[PDB]
Every structure is written in C-alpha cells, then in structure tokens.
C-alpha cells in the first residue's frame, strides 16, 4: 500500500476524530481496542483498519500498553477507521509545537489553507492559500521541520503562509 503522507495540520483538518488513546484470520478488517485519554476533535473504544499492511492496514508496533498515541481517523457507519495513510504517532514522539497544533493552532488553518506535499519534479503551487511541504524532498522523511514546527496559516486574504 503506498500513501501520500499527511502533514499533522492536514490530518487534523480532514479527520473526523483526533484523539489521544492507549492501545489495549479470513477477516477483511482488524480492530484494536483503545482507551481514549483525550479528544482534540469530534465532540470511542475501537479503531478499525484493513487486516493486512499490503491493503493499507495500520500495524501497531509498541509492546507498552501505557503508551499514548495520537490517532487521526475517519468515522464511517459508527466506526473509527485508520489506514497506513492516516496520521498515527506516539504522543511522546510529537514535538511540543505539534501538540499545540492538535490542541489549538491547526484549526486556524482548516477553512482557509491547504498543505500540499511536494512529491513531484517541478512541484507547483496552485494557490497562494497553499504552503509547499518539502520535508521529504529536503530530509528524506515526512518527520522534518515543517511537520514538527510549522502550521499553514492565513497571512492576508488569498495568502496562506508557513507560520510557527
């Protein structure tokens, strides 16, 4: 399964539920039992995902039940869904900036702005309301400075820019 990575702002703005939670066969979907410790969007005990990684099933790597995870997911027919293309990260792997994003700041960008991943050769901006996300281009990873310290916010009308 191959995904466009979501920037944390994107994940926040496009997901139905953004929560912190602990995690506790011939079958299409797998489910994990979770314990929500905080809700940041969507005002929840399982999260569903395709059963194999090959068809985009999140595979949870953590052998510590008290570890908190940020999950940004889609609600469908009553159920929270994630895939390999969702933003799912241990809370503690987030930078302080990113934590404030989910807590407060990302919501300022949702209506007005879009983060656009630079996944291609020229890599062209369609609007001044777009910010170009070049962490993969620059540092070979989506976990770069723009991800971990920058939100894509209104400057004036017609113009969003990267702000801290």
């Amino acid at each position: 399964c191959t995904c466009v990575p979501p920037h944390p702002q994107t994940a926040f703005c496009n997901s139905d539920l953004v929560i912190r939670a602990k995690f506790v066969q011939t079958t299409l979907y797998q489910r994990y039992e979770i314990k929500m410790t905080k809700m940041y969007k969507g005002f929840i005990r399982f999260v569903y995902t395709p059963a194999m990684e090959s068809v985009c099933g999140y595979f949870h790597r953590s052998h510590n039940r008290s570890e908190e995870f940020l999950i940004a997911g889609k609600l469908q027919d009553g159920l929270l869904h994630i895939t390999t293309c969702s933003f799912v990260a241990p809370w503690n792997s987030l930078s302080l900036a990113q934590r404030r994003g989910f807590t407060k700041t990302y919501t300022v960008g949702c209506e007005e702005c879009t983060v656009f991943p630079c996944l291609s050769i020229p890599c062209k901006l369609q609007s001044g309301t777009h910010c170009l996300w070049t962490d993969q281009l620059l540092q070979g990873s989506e976990k770069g400075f723009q991800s971990r310290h920058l939100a894509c916010l209104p400057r004036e009308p017609g113009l969003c820019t990267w702000q801290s």
Partner: protein, 159 residues
C-alpha cells in the same frame, strides 16, 4: 502464504491507465520486476490471457475487491501477498496521475513497492526503504537502487 512456494512466476498487465501509453506502463512494470529479479532466484514471465500469479491493473473507487480506492491522493495503490486468486495481485489507483518520470505519481517506484508485497514483504519503518509505506523514493529515480533493508527482507524469503 508468507512466500511463493515456486521460483518461476507469471504476471499480466490486465488493463491500462489512460494517463500513459501502453509501452510506458509496460516498461515501468518490467523495470519494477527487474529490481526484485536481480537480487533473488525468481523469474517473471508475461501472460496476456487467463489467470497469471501477479494480475496487475488500474482501478478507481470500488473495483471488485473489498478495499475501495479513495480518489486522488491518500492511498495510491495496494497489493496482496503470495497465494491464489486475488493474492499476489496489484491495483493502482487511477484517480492518481501516473507518470514515466516524477512529474506525477511515478508508476515504476509505486509498482516496485507493491511488487514487494506480492512477493511477501511487509512495510518497513526505515524512511529509506522501498517498503516504506509513504511515497518516499521519487528523489532517486535516475539511479534507483534497493535499500539494503529491502535486499535483507527479500533474500530472507528467497535466498
């Protein structure tokens, strides 16, 4: 199945994206198979009719399997591990724009990842692996080379 219990596999390109001329799809896929062929005892032969091991197609939204694609972006493609019927197969989201170079979504790079799953590989946590699940490789196209992490994973299966 964790691996193909045979060394000589068949593939077929069942349909063609309107994004690309047929020869362009063909070369991308051939190239992607070559990446794996050259570090394993496996061979791949092209069928044009009937049921091949690795059935390769383009689809949008609901397309016959139980995992609807999701329009432009998000998931670009998915695949199935070794086995019969659906198992082994590769589906590319035609709501993406497939390119020969990196101007759009590079077919070769995404086929090469998905072919990893067709052979038995799971996702890698190393941002430099092909098996990394994020479309992660486009910067290295002109001289593409498998990660040692990918080399390790494929040779652990096939020697």
């Amino acid at each position: 199945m964790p691996k193909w219990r045979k060394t000589h596999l068949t593939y077929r390109i069942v349909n063609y994206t309107p994004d690309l001329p047929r020869d362009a799809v063909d070369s991308a896929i051939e190239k992607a198979l070559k990446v794996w062929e050259e570090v394993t005892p496996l061979t791949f032969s092209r069928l044009y009719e009937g049921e091949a091991d690795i059935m390769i197609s383009f689809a949008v939204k609901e397309h016959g399997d139980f995992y609807s694609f999701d329009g432009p972006g998000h998931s670009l493609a998915h695949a199935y591990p070794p086995g019969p019927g659906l198992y082994g197969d590769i589906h590319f989201d035609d709501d993406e724009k497939w390119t020969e170079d990196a101007s759009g979504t590079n077919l070769f790079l995404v086929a090469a990842h998905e072919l990893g799953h067709s052979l038995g590989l799971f996702h890698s946590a190393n941002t430099e692996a092909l098996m990394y699940p994020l479309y992660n490789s486009f910067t290295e196209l002109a001289q593409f080379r498998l990660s040692q992490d990918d080399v390790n994973g494929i040779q652990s299966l096939y020697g």
